[PDB]
């Protein structure tokens, strides 16, 4: 048995057909095969679910931006495009990319070619392909941060589709000028020393069938868990020498959030420590891992296709041994690492080269209205490059000291506040878009989170919890987990028209996996759960103990009893 998508892939001539013919039909939508194919080119057909008894089709595009880095030229194009062809907003994402919603089919080619021609790409932003590769968003010049970022860029390059359907469709097979890929990447991509490649294929790594499902990699330096490393298919951590010189990488494998309500055979998972490789080996080890998934990940049932399942089934030792056959050597022992710390990168900070950066807090990544206009004026006036963070925030990079005051002023006039002036609950909150354009949403997330945050702060006040205190709150409209709610101290996961499943047990540094606490909590009822939990936390926590640590220490039995006993 093979899923319908495997056949669509098989019969597409490397992602061209019938997308090619559907893109030029008079219909406002495209057919089912083309719907599936266009995801590979970084676009999703959507319909607006706020308008009922009538389908208004539109397309969302999603960029590829390894490390979240966005060149000034690309930022200006995306901003203009959102107003001219979209619905006036840009959406920063939990994988450091932009999404642009609301593009009519007739304008879709115009918009992707514009992106292509302004230093951007949407290739493999969706699809059964490697997704945006995460890295530390802060533009620090510190050696190992720089090295994390370069490594992420090489991995994205290594795993970029090579078939040419992309430029064929969107820029009519034009040559598009880009900076040359490091010889390291080309050489690793081409290596077939260990039977990893299809050397006669237009896709020497992906082959005809690409991967069984999406594949996600994050890269970081020891200690910095802004990337939420444990949720990824591969987590890669730079290991240095005492003098700060990178020597190698620790690798984790087999994380993922996706699950389905009532299908207990689906579940979120933390990535396991796999091993260590010397720095020159990294692209070889990464391919070895991707090829293991390519060759063994289930293609019969898409709910079980992620790499996390093959690792759950096989166990990490059998997984490692299989990967080593393609790497052609053995992993060294995983090297001890320091404790993880979450970093928002928000506020005014130093790059280390004399310039400043500023992290702009953006609720839910939604950039629109005056805030959008003000950010574009700043970014254009100062010719800034920018960086998108995995918490849906934006960093303004490369700022002269003398520009600090004028920028701070302009941002304040637009209501874009410095972290000291934002409720700490907002600073660490995320929600996925959900309704109205997500076809999978069961309830609101982005459009309901901010009244929920205010409700949580009201519970804190009522309990007598200080206003500098906080918990990580993440909300999704369905259990796919796009805002990583299974890592949250307090997750709400849509499970009915106005009800959420509550998850607890995540920690402030995203080092632990939350567990399902209660099902079908109605939106109206959330305080009946929260007030007793936060009363018990305030009354019994140890000094400075986070709500997530407290949760894991006290355990669900006592927590349900406190909640039960309130009602």
């Amino acid at each position: 048995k093979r899923s319908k998508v495997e056949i669509i892939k098989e019969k597409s001539n490397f992602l061209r057909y019938p997308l090619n013919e559907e893109l030029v039909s008079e219909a406002p939508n495209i057919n089912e095969s083309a719907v599936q194919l266009i995801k590979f080119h970084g676009s999703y057909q959507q319909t607006d679910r706020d308008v009922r008894g009538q389908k208004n089709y539109s397309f969302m595009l999603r960029t590829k931006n390894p490390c979240g880095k966005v060149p000034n030229q690309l930022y200006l194009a995306m901003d203009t495009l959102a107003d001219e062809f979209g619905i006036g907003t840009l959406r920063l994402t939990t994988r450091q990319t932009f999404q642009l919603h609301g593009v009519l089919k007739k304008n879709l080619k115009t918009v992707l070619s514009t992106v292509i021609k302004n230093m951007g790409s949407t290739l493999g932003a969706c699809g059964d392909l490697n997704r945006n590769v995460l890295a530390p968003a802060a533009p620090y010049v510190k050696k190992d941060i720089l090295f994390a970022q370069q490594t992420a860029e090489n991995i994205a390059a290594l795993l970029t589709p090579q078939s040419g359907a992309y430029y064929d469709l969107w820029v009519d097979g034009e040559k598009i000028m880009s900076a040359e890929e490091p010889p390291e990447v080309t050489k690793a991509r081409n290596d077939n020393s260990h039977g990893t490649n299809f050397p006669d294929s237009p896709e020497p790594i992906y082959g005809t069938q690409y991967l069984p499902r999406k594949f996600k990699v994050a890269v970081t330096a020891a200690g910095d868990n802004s990337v939420d490393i444990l949720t990824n298919d591969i987590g890669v951590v730079v290991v240095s020498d005492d003098a700060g010189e990178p020597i190698g990488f620790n690798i984790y494998v087999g994380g993922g959030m996706g699950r389905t309500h009532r299908v207990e055979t689906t579940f979120p998972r933390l990535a396991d420590p796999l091993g260590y490789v010397p720095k020159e080996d990294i692209l070889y080890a990464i391919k070895a891992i991707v090829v293991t998934q390519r060759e063994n990940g289930r293609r019969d049932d898409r709910k079980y296709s992620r790499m996390k399942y093959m690792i759950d089934r096989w166990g990490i030792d059998r997984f490692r041994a299989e990967v080593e056959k393609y790497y052609g050597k053995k992993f060294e022992s995983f090297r001890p690492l320091p404790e993880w710390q979450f970093n928002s990168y928000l506020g005014w900070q130093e790059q280390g080269d004399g310039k400043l950066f500023y992290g702009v807090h953006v609720d839910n990544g939604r950039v629109g209205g005056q805030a959008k206009k003000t950010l574009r004026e700043i970014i254009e006036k100062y010719n800034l490059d920018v960086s998108i963070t995995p918490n849906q925030n934006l960093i303004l990079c490369g700022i002269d000291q003398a520009w600090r005051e004028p920028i701070t002023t302009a941002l304040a006039q637009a209501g874009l506040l410095e972290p000291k002036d934002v409720d700490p609950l907002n600073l660490t909150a995320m929600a996925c878009p959900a309704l109205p354009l997500c076809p999978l949403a069961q309830t609101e997330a982005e459009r309901g989170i901010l009244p929920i945050l205010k409700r949580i702060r009201a519970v804190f006040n009522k309990v007598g919890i200080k206003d500098s205190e906080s918990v990580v709150v993440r909300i999704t409209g369905c259990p796919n987990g796009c805002a990583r709610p299974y890592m949250a101290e307090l997750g709400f996961v849509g499970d009915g028209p106005k009800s959420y499943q509550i998850w607890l047990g995540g920690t402030p540094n995203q080092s632990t996996l939350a567990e399902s606490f209660m099902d079908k909590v109605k939106l109206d009822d959330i305080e009946k759960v929260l007030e007793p939990l936060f009363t018990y936390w305030n009354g019994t926590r140890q000094e400075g103990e986070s709500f997530g640590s407290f949760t894991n220490r006290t355990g669900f039995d006592k927590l349900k009893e406190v909640v039960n006993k309130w009602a």
Partner: protein, 96 residues
């Protein structure tokens, strides 16, 4: 408008009253009636039923093609009653 919705389940006939702005699955569960589901976004066969009399608005759904809807199949998670309606539930296997 609220309609009589008779559900033919492997266990019995249950009769419920559902508003024309409330998905059949959503109302059923709200009463205490256990029906199958997975995605609850009209994108699969989990909640599949058969319409045996009456009509529904299931235009939010996306899984079934036009032929299958013409044959009276329904995704109950994404279906609004538009009349009194009899539905045989737990028909995913039949489909499928």
């Amino acid at each position: 408008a609220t309609y009589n919705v008779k559900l033919i389940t492997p266990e019995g006939e249950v009769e419920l009253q559902v508003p024309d702005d409330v998905y059949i699955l959503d109302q059923a569960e709200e009463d205490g009636i256990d029906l199958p589901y997975s995605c609850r976004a009209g994108s699969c066969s989990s909640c599949a039923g058969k319409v045996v009399s009456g009509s529904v608005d299931q235009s939010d759904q996306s899984y079934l093609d036009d032929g299958q809807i013409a044959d009276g199949w329904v995704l109950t998670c994404h279906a609004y009653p538009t009349s009194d309606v009899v539905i045989e539930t737990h028909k995913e296997e039949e489909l499928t």
